[PDB]
Amino acid sequence: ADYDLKFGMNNGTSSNEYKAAEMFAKEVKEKSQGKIEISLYPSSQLGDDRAMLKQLKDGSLDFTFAESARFQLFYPEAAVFALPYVISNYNVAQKALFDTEFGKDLIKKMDKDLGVTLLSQAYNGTRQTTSNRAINSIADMKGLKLRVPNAATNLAYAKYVGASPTPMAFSEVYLALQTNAVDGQENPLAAVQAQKFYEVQKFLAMTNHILNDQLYLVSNETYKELPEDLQKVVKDAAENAAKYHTKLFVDGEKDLVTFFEKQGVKITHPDLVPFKESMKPYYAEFVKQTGQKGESALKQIEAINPHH
Ligand SMILES: O=C(CO)N[C@H]1[C@H]([C@H](O)[C@H](O)CO)O[C@](O)(C(=O)O)C[C@@H]1O
């Protein structure tokens, strides 16, 4: 094609993210009259999200996904998006990114500093905790060998609830669980399904601890080369795909508990009051480390009403 573009993904081929990326690619090919073709590179074949964000920066990869919270790697205050239990729901995630001074500034910095244009935002689910033994209460977290991604907010979730975290890339998790090198992991329901973690985890606890969005990102080096009509094709396709993407997650949060029960998983509902209480010293540490910018981002987010 005139523009042979590439979309790198950490997710695998059986995921919502992949389905939405397929929709995006098909729409772009059609509405560009075949001038743009977007090939898909899932399963972290190009590296993880941190790696793929670097590839968009240097222009060697055209599209990828990232969470708003992942930008805490560059702007520590952006950890606010994944401080456990701070963002209430997707409604708050959307307004936090687009409708706060903090979020509007973050989007500008991603462009100026990091070489990426934000095309759209989707919902990527609320993280829950799977394990090889029941989590009936916060006590069951104590000493649980909990795999986390290489992200400070997930490490802190594990630490503060009393678990023993082991960081590793998404691709390594299934084997870690299978072999009982670790006892559990935490991810939205849809990822537990996509990765078949349910094959290797007998229990699922509704910890409801971190809310993931998902950003459709394009390399500035690629977006600038597209004539403006093709920029619009890409943007409009990203927005259409993000709505579809969110709906896949919303619907699965209704449908997946019955799916996991049919696969033999036992679902628990621990009292979340002590989970939330346990984060109070973490929020204090966040404010100490990130200073007024962090206090301000928290204030801006805590002001958002979660009811549509
Ligand atoms: O790579 C991306 C891009 O948004 N997100 C990944 C996501 C992300 O890297 C973490 O939430 C940290 O921001 O981590 C996981 O949930 C995981 O490793 O458990 C996989 C998910 O695909």
Side-chain angles (χ1 to χ4, degrees):
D2 285 359
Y3 305 91
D4 292 323
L5 305 185
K6 302 177 185 303
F7 192 142
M9 285 171 276
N10 203 7
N11 63 261
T13 62
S14 299
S15 66
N16 295 335
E17 293 97 315
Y18 189 85
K19 290 174 180 64
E22 285 183 301
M23 174 182 172
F24 174 64
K26 178 169 189 273
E27 179 178 338
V28 169
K29 184 177 183 179
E30 289 171 352
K31 293 193 171 302
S32 71
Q33 277 87 229
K35 287 178 166 288
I36 302 172
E37 287 175 357
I38 304 177
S39 300
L40 308 182
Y41 298 85
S43 299
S44 65
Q45 68 188 274
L46 307 178
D48 73 344
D49 55 341
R50 294 174 297 172
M52 290 182 279
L53 278 172
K54 290 175 195 188
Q55 297 160 216
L56 270 63
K57 185 180 185 189
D58 75 18
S60 64
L61 181 59
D62 310 291
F63 302 96
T64 201
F65 288 130
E67 298 163 3
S68 294
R70 195 50 144 170
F71 294 89
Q72 72 184 275
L73 296 167
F74 301 102
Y75 314 106
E77 63 275 17
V80 70
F81 287 106
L83 298 170
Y85 308 108
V86 172
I87 297 260
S88 296
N89 66 10
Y90 184 56
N91 292 341
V92 173
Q94 296 187 110
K95 287 178 180 177
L97 181 58
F98 292 110
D99 301 347
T100 68
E101 294 302 313
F102 161 67
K104 289 181 211 160
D105 176 71
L106 180 58
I107 297 167
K108 288 174 37 53
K109 285 194 305 197
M110 289 160 34
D111 185 3
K112 181 176 70 68
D113 306 337
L114 304 176
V116 299
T117 292
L118 173 56
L119 295 169
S120 62
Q121 176 197 46
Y123 177 51
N124 222 69
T126 300
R127 304 187 77 94
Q128 309 300 347
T129 307
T130 67
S131 48
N132 62 9
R133 49 171 181 86
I135 299 168
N136 301 132
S137 76
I138 203 176
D140 293 304
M141 298 304 296
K142 188 73 174 181
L144 186 76
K145 297 176 177 56
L146 184 59
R147 176 271 168 171
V148 292
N150 294 292
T153 34
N154 307 70
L155 280 159
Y157 167 66
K159 174 175 156 64
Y160 287 88
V161 297
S164 297
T166 295
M168 70 189 68
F170 193 49
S171 57
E172 306 307 280
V173 177
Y174 186 102
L175 176 71
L177 303 171
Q178 186 178 223
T179 64
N180 290 307
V182 297
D183 298 320
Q185 62 81 56
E186 48 79 51
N187 256 117
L189 300 183
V192 175
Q193 176 193 29
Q195 293 295 103
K196 296 203 169 72
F197 296 153
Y198 62 88
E199 294 182 331
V200 292
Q201 300 277 263
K202 290 286 187 183
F203 299 89
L204 165 60
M206 304 302 288
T207 55
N208 297 310
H209 56 278
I210 286 170
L211 192 130
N212 291 328
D213 70 347
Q214 206 75 177
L215 310 180
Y216 288 67
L217 301 176
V218 60
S219 175
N220 290 352
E221 193 172 0
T222 300
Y223 200 61
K224 81 180 175 187
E225 86 193 1
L226 296 177
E228 178 277 344
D229 59 304
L230 293 185
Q231 292 177 329
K232 180 175 191 303
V233 165
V234 164
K235 169 75 168 175
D236 289 343
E239 292 285 13
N240 286 332
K243 289 176 176 84
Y244 169 69
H245 186 139
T246 292
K247 183 160 199 294
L248 289 174
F249 281 91
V250 170
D251 291 347
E253 284 178 346
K254 308 200 284 269
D255 297 325
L256 282 173
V257 149
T258 87
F259 169 89
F260 292 128
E261 286 179 336
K262 183 177 181 75
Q263 299 294 323
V265 177
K266 170 68 168 184
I267 310 280
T268 66
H269 299 267
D271 179 1
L272 302 184
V273 168
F275 281 76
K276 289 172 183 184
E277 286 173 333
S278 80
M279 303 295 141
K280 290 191 176 167
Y282 180 38
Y283 306 152
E285 187 64 15
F286 167 84
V287 159
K288 179 180 176 189
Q289 291 306 324
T290 64
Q292 292 194 288
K293 286 174 180 170
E295 293 188 306
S296 183
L298 280 164
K299 176 181 169 198
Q300 291 174 58
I301 287 168
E302 295 188 317
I304 298 169
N305 195 279
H307 180 44
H308 76 274

